[PDB]
């Protein structure tokens, strides 16, 4: 059993506004462990009662058929039953448009509480047809405390700075730090969790590699760039992770605003190219060439 | 300039400061052919290797099924019928014009195959034909193991992913085109029968206008307009004329432009022009992708401007030696046959309990495998210790060839010289042209390797 559901328990005001309906469609978004599904289920139990239950959800044809068979059905007798559709963020644009159509022709007697990771919604359900409610993530200190408690009751040997690093590499949510802790204690046999094991589990590139990349760029010789990028690709480090860490380093150190601007334009277009399936090695070589041009000024 | 050094007196503004803090202020605002069908074996045309080499196999050396390849119109449909007529055999035919459900595909051929004729005993033999093949296929594969009457499936590529494993038990022939030395005589006889007159030169021209197609030739006693587009674009408003003149199929126009724009001689320093032309070709490719991914008919109004873009850039004073585009299609079918051959080899190797490598990883790393297969060519004479220590040598090498199912077979060139070729012929899968060529294996060494392969097969079994 994963530690995610084992420990799944601020936003009761949305439950209050939902009960005060004597009702629109709902759009709950936020980091996954922020209890959006639990919130809507609690609102369900409070608004109908324990004896009345709802519909929770292959493509879109089966979704439309199920919603039709469910909404076009007489209720016990409150007027509007709902349908959830969690993980809506993964729906394609055509599936989202078909779902928007399904929300119509059924809006007379049913409601939808879409659960998503934010901006993935197309303009039709996101704007109009939904009441948005953002679920803020737990703050860093509370997250570290919760990870400490999990490590205590699971006899996991992790240090406090290890917990801080675990929250850092999974910034903005639980259920990723928790999974990383579980995978780390499985990989190490629980005996000891260090920085390197968390770094490898999270897929983070070591800071020594990033420092070497900047050193090679500052060296001004393209041969060193080729060597460092070839080594970074050979080590198997994802190019998107290198782009993220490189951007985090660049945007915060003491480079010139023009140098930061050029490097960040390059990082953004490299991120777009990598999203389109471009070669990691060529994208990283071009990015490091731009960085070398900026540093070797 | 819009940039101000001091804030506007009565206008809304925002300020922009430099990296040094200098600061500045910006305002913010607000009919004939079937009449002359071959009546007897003597009405066939000469210089033909098809009808002269299938009657050898069709008598009653142990091939089961038949197949087709080569160009169309070569009488592949009528050769079987006239051979049946001459040898005293009957004919059957089938199509996709009727319902070829997988189940009915069985019974539509079983009747043709395993029953005799309700007639005189002379007419009992039958000849069978299957047409327009490119559930039922799996049934064909199941039946092809054992059969009594060979069948013809009309295709044109023996290197197919499915029919290659059927042609291995089939006596597929050579398919040379029919030379017109007697086409003109046949057409003269046809015209005399039909009361028409034409000189030999005129008749020959009418024959060669249609690539000497006998069907079209006999229908003549009664091409491609893309060269016009290529001529209008490649030699001298004009551009509106090319936009209007591109009324036709567009993919082949673009193929012709791509194949021919590097053969013109406007300038040797036109690398900028060819860069712009390749930019336009990439734009056309992206348009083709985007009009399909996001189905949009309005987005395919731009591709007609590719010929216009190849004008302006490359329009010159004549010298338009324009050839038909073949590079893209030839590359397509060659890569398809390479993919079929790698599939054949990988089916030989990958699931054989071992050989843990991706087919792509294997393909990029198989030339070294051939180099291990090379082996010292010391021409072993002794029945033991084949010029070296056998275990670290030819024994392990024949083991690894049996792993990949690589074998050496016998072939005879038309020159008559003996030759051995690797069984799935992975060399041309692996080797490239115009780079330093390595020496190959001797004939007798390949014979020894084949013999060792056979004894290894006997030992493993």
């Amino acid at each position: 059993v994963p530690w995610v559901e084992k420990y799944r328990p601020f936003q009761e005001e949305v439950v209050a506004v939902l009960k005060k309906s004597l009702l629109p469609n709902l759009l709950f978004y936020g980091p996954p462990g922020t209890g959006k599904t639990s919130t809507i289920l609690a609102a369900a139990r409070e608004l109908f009662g324990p004896e009345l239950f709802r519909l929770r959800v292959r493509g879109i044809q089966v979704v439309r058929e199920k919603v039709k068979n469910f909404a076009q059905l007489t209720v016990s007798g409150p007027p509007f039953k709902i349908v959830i559709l969690d993980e809506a963020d993964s729906m394609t644009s055509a599936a989202q448009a078909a779902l928007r159509r399904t929300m119509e022709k059924e809006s007379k007697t049913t409601r939808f509480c879409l659960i998503c990771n934010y901006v993935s919604r197309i303009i039709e359900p996101l704007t109009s047809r939904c009441s948005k409610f953002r679920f803020k993530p737990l703050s860093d200190k509370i997250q570290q405390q919760r990870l400490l408690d999990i490590a205590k009751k699971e006899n996991v040997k992790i240090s406090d700075e290890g917990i801080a690093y675990l929250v850092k590499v999974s910034e903005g949510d639980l259920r990723k730090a928790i999974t990383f802790l579980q995978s780390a204690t499985r990989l190490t046999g629980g005996k000891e969790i260090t920085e390197k094991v968390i770094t490898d589990i999270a897929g983070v590139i070591p800071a020594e590699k990033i420092d070497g990349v900047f050193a090679a760029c500052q060296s001004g010789s393209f041969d060193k760039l080729e060597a460092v990028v070839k080594d970074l690709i050979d080590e198997g480090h994802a190019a998107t992770q290198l782009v993220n860490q490189l951007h985090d380093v660049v945007v915060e150190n003491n480079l010139s605003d023009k140098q930061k601007s050029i490097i960040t334009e390059k990082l953004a277009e490299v991120d777009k190219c990598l999203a389109d399936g471009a070669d990691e090695h060529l994208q990283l070589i071009s990015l490091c060439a731009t960085v070398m041009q900026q540093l070797s000024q | 300039n819009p940039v101000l050094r001091r804030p506007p007196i009565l206008e809304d503004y925002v300020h922009v400061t430099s990296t040094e803090g200098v600061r500045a202020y910006l305002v913010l605002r607000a009919l004939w052919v079937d009449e002359f069908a071959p009546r007897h074996y003597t009405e066939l045309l000469s210089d033909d290797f098809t009808n002269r080499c299938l009657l050898k196999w069709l008598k009653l050396p142990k091939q089961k099924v038949a197949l087709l390849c080569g160009p169309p119109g070569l009488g592949k449909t009528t050769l079987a019928h006239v051979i049946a007529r001459h040898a005293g055999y009957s004919v059957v035919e089938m199509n996709a014009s009727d319902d070829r459900s997988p189940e009915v595909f069985r019974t539509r051929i079983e009747a043709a195959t395993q029953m005799e004729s309700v007639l005189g005993a002379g007419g009992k033999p039958n000849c069978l034909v299957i047409d327009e093949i490119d559930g039922g296929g799996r049934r064909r594969r199941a039946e092809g193991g054992l059969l009594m009457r060979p069948i013809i499936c009309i295709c044109n590529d023996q290197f197919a992913p499915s029919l290659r494993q059927l042609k291995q038990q089939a006596f597929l022939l050579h398919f040379p085109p029919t030379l017109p030395s007697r086409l003109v005589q046949r057409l003269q006889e046809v015209s005399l029968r039909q009361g028409m007159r034409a000189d030999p030169g005129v008749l020959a021209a009418l024959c060669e206008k249609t690539d000497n197609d006998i069907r079209a030739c006999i229908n003549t006693l009664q091409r491609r307009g893309l060269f016009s587009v290529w001529q209008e674009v490649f030699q001298l408003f004009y551009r509106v004329l090319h936009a209007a003149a591109s009324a036709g199929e567009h993919e082949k126009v673009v193929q012709g432009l791509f194949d021919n724009f590097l053969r013109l001689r406007l300038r040797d320093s036109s690398l900028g022009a060819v860069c712009v032309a390749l930019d336009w070709l990439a734009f056309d490719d992206l348009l083709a992708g985007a009009a399909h991914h996001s189905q949009s008919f309005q987005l395919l109004r731009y591709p007609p401007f590719l010929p216009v873009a190849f004008h302006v850039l490359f329009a010159s004073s004549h010298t338009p030696r324009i050839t038909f585009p073949s590079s893209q299609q030839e590359a397509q079918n060659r890569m398809s046959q390479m993919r079929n051959l790698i599939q054949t080899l990988v089916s030989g190797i990958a699931p054989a309990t071992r050989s843990r490598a991706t087919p792509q990883a294997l393909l990029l790393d198989a030339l070294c495998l051939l180099l291990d297969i090379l082996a010292p060519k010391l021409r072993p004479v002794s029945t033991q210790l084949y010029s070296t220590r056998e275990k670290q040598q030819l024994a392990s090498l024949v083991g690894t060839m049996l792993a990949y199912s690589l074998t050496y077979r016998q072939e005879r060139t038309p020159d008559g010289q003996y030759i051995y070729r690797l069984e799935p012929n992975v060399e041309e899968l692996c080797r490239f042209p115009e780079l330093p060529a390595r020496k190959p294996l001797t004939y007798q060494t390949k014979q020894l390797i084949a013999r060792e392969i056979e004894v290894e097969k006997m030992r493993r079994a």
């Binding site: 994963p2 589990i201 060529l282 | 559930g135 900028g272 699931p351 490598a357």
Partner: protein, 345 residues
């Protein structure tokens, strides 16, 4: 049973010649319960498949090496071949083309429904090793994550790819990232020397280093070239003529031809060479990578940045488009324009 590249593939995690720390971690992972879904990645020749087979060997029994061919059909019908064992199924759903979604769904459905036939003596799941997950389509990957989360209790997935860039983030979330780096030059020298020793041979360190550098840290290349240079000359020499594939040589000669003259005639000749490379079924991105690597050897330091940026730009456009020759050819043309202007001035 004879190839050096296969004769000395380690059987168990305990006999891996490199990444021993990760092998120990993997044995710890298999030793405990609730074996998760693995996403093993790393450059080709790093050992991903070797590590996966070893993971199975301590996970299931030795009979995991008793590999037998299987074939199945899908409903769209497309026939696909697989490789299975008494405990795991290995399938590359990419080769089914755009119908990879239905084939992956059908394979996992069938294996999960078939594991229930009293097959729980060793483990309570069947491993479905997917190879070349990065070659799947987005819809296939969404079907994969759905099937993964739906039959987690009865079947386990191991995903093997060379780069996790094309793997959708949702799949990366559900799986455990097992990064298998390419072996270092020293590790490749050590394994080559051990192979030679176990073969009753002797390998000079200079030749081992030369093979390691020429292999580009691909271990199967290192072993293949070692065996090829062995059969070419039984006593190794520190300056031996180590062979290499003809597609690499052809790519290098293509780049040399691009450098040697910058004219549309040379452009058409290089286009013919690009056809030769493409039709031999080597990936267009590999062509671009090798072309750039050799072109940089023939460029001044002031030119290498622009050449590399053009290579990345045109490989990106190649990924967007559908005809690789257009963008390969445009890259070659742009490079000759730049090189001609630079050498001219």
């Amino acid at each position: 049973m004879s190839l050096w590249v296969d004769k000395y593939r380690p059987c168990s995690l305990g006999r891996l010649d490199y990444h021993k720390e990760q092998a120990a971690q993997l044995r710890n992972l298999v030793q405990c319960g609730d074996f998760p879904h693995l996403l093993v990645y790393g450059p080709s020749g790093a050992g991903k498949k070797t590590r996966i087979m070893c993971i199975l060997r301590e996970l299931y029994g030795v009979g995991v090496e008793k590999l037998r061919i299987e074939h199945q059909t899908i409903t769209t019908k497309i026939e696909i071949s697989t490789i299975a064992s008494n405990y795991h199924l290995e399938v590359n759903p990419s080769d089914a083309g755009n119908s990879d979604r239905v084939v992956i769904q059908e394979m996992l459905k069938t294996v999960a429904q078939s594991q229930q036939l009293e097959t729980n003596s060793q483990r309570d799941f069947k491993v479905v090793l997917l190879t070349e997950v990065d070659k799947l389509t987005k819809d296939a990957q969404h079907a994969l994550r759905r099937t993964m989360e739906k039959y987690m209790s009865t079947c386990r997935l191991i995903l093997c790819c060379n780069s996790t860039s094309k793997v959708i983030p949702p799949i990366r979330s559900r799986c455990l990232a097992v990064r298998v780096p390419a072996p270092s030059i020293e590790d490749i020298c050590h394994v080559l020397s051990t192979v030679c020793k176990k073969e009753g041979l002797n390998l000079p360190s200079q030749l081992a280093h030369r093979l390691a550098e020429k292999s580009c840290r691909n271990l199967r290349k290192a072993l293949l070239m070692c065996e090829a240079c062995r059969v070419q000359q039984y006593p190794f020499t520190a300056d031996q003529e180590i062979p290499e594939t003809d597609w690499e040589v052809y790519l290098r000669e293509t780049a040399n031809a691009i450098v040697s003259q910058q004219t549309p005639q040379r452009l058409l000749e290089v286009r013919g060479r690009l056809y030769e490379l493409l039709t031999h079924c080597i990936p267009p991105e590999i062509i671009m990578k090798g072309l750039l690597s050799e072109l940089l050897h023939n460029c001044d330091g002031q030119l290498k940045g622009e050449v590399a940026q053009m290579a990345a730009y045109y490989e990106h456009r190649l990924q967007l488009g559908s005809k690789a020759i257009y963008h390969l050819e445009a890259f070659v043309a742009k490079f000759m324009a730049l090189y001609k202007k630079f050498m001219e001035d």
